[PDB]
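Re: the multi-chain job from yesterday

Posting the exact lines I submitted so nobody has to dig through the queue logs.
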Amino acid sequence: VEFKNSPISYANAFVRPVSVVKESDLVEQSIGQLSNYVNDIRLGYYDEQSPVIG
Amino acid sequence: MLIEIHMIQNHSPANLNRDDLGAPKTCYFGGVLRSRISSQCIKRSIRTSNDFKALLGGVRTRRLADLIQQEAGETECWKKAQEILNKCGFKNKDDNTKMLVFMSKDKIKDLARIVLDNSLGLTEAAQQVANVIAQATLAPDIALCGRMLEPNDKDKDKKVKWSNTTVEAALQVAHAISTHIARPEIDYFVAADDVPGIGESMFASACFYKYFSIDWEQLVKNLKGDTNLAAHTVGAFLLAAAKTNPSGKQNSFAAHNYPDGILVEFKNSPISYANAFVRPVSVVKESDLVEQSIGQLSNYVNDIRLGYYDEQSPVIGFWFSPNNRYPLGYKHSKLASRNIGNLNELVGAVLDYIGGFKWEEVQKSKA
Amino acid sequence: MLIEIHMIQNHSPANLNRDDLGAPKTCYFGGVLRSRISSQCIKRSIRTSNDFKALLGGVRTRRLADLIQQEAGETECWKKAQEILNKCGFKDNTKMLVFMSKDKIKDLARIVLDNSLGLTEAAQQVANVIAQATLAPDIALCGRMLEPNDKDKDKKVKWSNTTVEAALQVAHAISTHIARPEIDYFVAASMFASACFYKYFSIDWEQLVKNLKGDTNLAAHTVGAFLLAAAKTNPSGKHNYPDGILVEFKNSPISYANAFVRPVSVVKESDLVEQSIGQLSNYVNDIRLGYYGFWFSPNNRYPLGYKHSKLASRNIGNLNELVGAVLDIGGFKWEEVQKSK
Amino acid sequence: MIYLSRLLIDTGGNPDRPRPGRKWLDNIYNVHRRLSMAFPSGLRREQDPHFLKPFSPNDFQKTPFLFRVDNNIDGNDKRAIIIVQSVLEPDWDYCFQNALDFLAAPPETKEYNPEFKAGQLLRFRLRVNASVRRHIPEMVQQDGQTIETGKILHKRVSLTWDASSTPDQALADWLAAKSPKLGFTLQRCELLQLGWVYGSKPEPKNVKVKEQGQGYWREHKYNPLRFRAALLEGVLEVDDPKLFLKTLSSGIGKAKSFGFGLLSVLPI
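And the result, structure tokens for all chains:
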């Protein structure tokens, strides 16, 4: 749940379909890929103010 | 008000449910192949059981003129009843009676009186049949399902009007699935003649989890009151689900197995624990599959109960194990409000929590 | 009466269950390769069981033509075969498993000779005999389905329901273990390994006894001979007395083929059969205290009684006395029973 | 020297998928042929290293090898084992370079120089071709009546025991009747698995003369191949050195080209 002036859709994290492996499940990989894309967007699209309190 | 039901059942190797392949049903969940039992098969097995026999009063028929002819007696009434059913509009197209009716209507004698009445035309008795068929609503198997009739408009007369045909069923049955990955095996056979002078059959094995949820208010409202019938049907369906298996090739694939763990909860919302088996269970040497499955469900139940807790809606849960074989809260959690060692007192306590009903007097409510 | 019949048996690499390219029977209970027992194998094996000749009426065949000039002295014909078997609709060619009874095939061999015959009429006079042959421990327990080719039927042909069913259920003996990998002879420069098999069969009542449309002493003899058979007959083999028998006077068959989900593993495999017992007693006690039985041991070797609990009615050291107790079913004594053809 | 090899086949998993290696084992002629291309001609391996040419029998070297097929090895996976014994070095990378889906493991080979002393306790496993050549009269037709014709057939049939003896005793007698000539003596021998083996084989047959000439048009016709098989395991003791080595890598029974003689020896 996020609060930000302009709307951002984190939908391009799932361009690569999640493939299962013997170590982990579908939920863990999906949430991990979402985490990676969220970090990439946050570190890549701002350097000043608006510390998006989500 | 909703009661949720949780069967933790391990099966012996068999073939209980198959498609036209002869192979067992399967599904994908969490991205891997699993075993599958369809919910209509489970309902069909539980409906045709000894425990769910007193409330077995609804009938699903494709051939209605036969029981009319039997109920009327020694007279000849097949052709007139069949023509009445034809002009009523019961899909005489394409040579089949493929439409199915889910009436209870165990008092067939009314329709027999209508068809045997030598006083009315062939249009009016059709409407009398159309009026009696749409009013049964009894026999609590139709308090669990029931979408009795969609009349075809093409083959019916222009002088018939139909009434409402929805009962608003209350029971939600999830598809039975496995806690691991299914592995199929081919069994070869041979006839091998007695008188002197290879085929392929499929089966697999899996341990299952089941989810049943019942809305008590809708169950009462679908029987038009009589909370004694609702209580009797709750107890009878719980007793049925505790001991019922499909009769699929049981003569050669006998799999008469009981659930290992039985769980009930009381809350005003439907919640499934189907995500507890997102990760399929791999066996360690120090334990078995069933203990790993109940531990997964226990951790999941602790996590969800600590996940969505609301002070306005408390949750009360009972746990049952065969002579306390499989505890739920193994490590530290007292997740269940009470642990019961026998099935009969479990269903009795369920009835007591529902409305204080005892199993002795509510069994007299046959209907 | 829904009686359940356990039959845990130590089995062999020369006498077990084999198949296709030579490999033994392999199932996947608990998600680990175990070994199973065909409810099929045991079927063409209870027939000629060492002691199964006194109650056995099942002539099944895929040929009812060479078999015709057999009880007949009409040594001059066989071109009638291409008219009767082929008119009723039993057409590969003339191939349809016909399972019946062995005491009334003399009539199957009787109207044949009758020369003047409505070949296009009384064909169904041998086919009318195809209606009921349930009088022996065969179809009451086994079964047949004689579906006739429908695209060759006669103008008439009365084909009464030619469909039967079984009654008793036969269940795969489920290995208590991952089977044993053998002596691979690539790395090179009472001599093998056996698999255990908790055998299980169950028999109910109104189709278990009432399919004899008449007899019942025959029902008692069928029960006694069927319990006597499986003990001492070899599914593709050949004292081998079973280690422990539980017989219950309950009213439900129960594939107890679950109890053993953990594949009894073994360091020194001289006791691969010794994990059924105490574990079975534990699961029996758990069921009996959770959801609601005579015992046989060879010279009382393996008791199942928790050393304090009366979960078994009595313990019997002889197979014959156990059979007598089971029959004492309706009161029949073994003498009465045995006297059944 | 003597060369031994091992091939591993899965024979399991999902039955709904194509399994060419599982399909290859249903015919014994195909199994023998597939082991048989494992030895090309000095010229063939220089002509097609990719093995992408028509297969002819004459461009491959001839060697009387022996093999056996075994099953039921657990470890949560199923396996099928082919053991090949030969007097030349097999080329497993040439036979299966376009057939890797057959096998669940890469092939292995090793040398074998078995040296023994007389009077040595040895463990052996052998599947024997239980066949006897007999005189048989000729029955025809059997169209409800048996017709007899005076021709007497010299044909190879299975060994038959009587009604009062076990199969193991008769098989042991049949093996001890032969063990003095091979150079060994039995002490114990039990029957493990007895059965039949089917095979089918292409055979050319003439149909029509070519209009342009120079040969025929031809058509493949297939002939059945039935043999009797009985797998045996036991313990033997040696009686002669160069005689036990005469027994090994030559065969004990018949039908050796279809994998019916192979002695697997362990010093117990």
